[model samples]
Target chain A: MNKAHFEVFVDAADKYRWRLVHDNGNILADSGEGYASKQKAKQGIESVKRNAPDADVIEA
Target chain B: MNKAHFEVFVDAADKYRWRLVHDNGNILADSGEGYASKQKAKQGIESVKRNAPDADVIEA
Candidate 1:
């Protein structure tokens, strides 16, 4: 089973970002942008957890 | 001023990793590998903080 999880981290500038990690300890996805506060970053994670699976997957 | 810092985190499998973030909240370097424990991964950070400055800037 490929267990996946998200993590939120504070950066050097006191901003926050998140990333997805797989069971094998490899990164799957990164937020690419940072939020000014941890609460906003947590909201970012909530958005992903609730919305990612239902999103449309399409060609760019 | 380009302030840089390091952070350690655990993956889904309980493995540890580290990353370097620039002051603007952008990632500059990642561990590129996982460690079995937090202390081991932290040691990796020490290596970077203590030795990376002395590293040769060679073009591969």
Candidate 2:
């Protein structure tokens, strides 16, 4: 099984971004919103980490 | 403002996954489920890319 992890980087627009990656090299998730600062960007990731574990999986 | 993008990776369980990221390094969203293959993971990202733009931002 692949251990999930996060990858952070800057985009062409010069904004900060991040992605969730699996051990096998597949992407699991990402931050769709743009941020003005890396600190805010990191805070966004932290929100996801804090909220996601208890998030619901609804099938629409 | 930072542009948004996606990242791909594998997990310890050998499942494929993806995340949406901002150019500023914030993670916006993630594939909550583990994919059996990389192709599936990519498809998951595609779904978000296609549907997210029109998706509503509801407040809880």
lDDT scores in order = 0.51, 0.57
lDDT of 2 by residue, A1-60 (tens): 225556567778988766655556655556656666776666656655544443333321
- What's each prediction's TM-score? 0.45, 0.50
Tens digits of lDDT, candidate 1, A1-60: 235555678777878766555555655444445768766665544543333333222211
Q: Which candidate is the best by DockQ?
A: 2
lDDT of 1 by residue, B1-60 (tens): 235456678767778876555556655444446768777776655443333333222111
Q: Give the TM-score of candidate 2.
A: 0.50
lDDT of 2 by residue, B1-60 (tens): 235555667777988766655545655687755866877777766544433333322211
* DockQ of each two-chain model: 0.03, 0.11
Model 2 lDDT at residue B5: 55
True contacts kept of 2: 0.17
Q: What's the distance in Å from true for residue B32, model 2?
A: 10
Whole-model alpha-carbon lDDT for candidate 2? 0.57
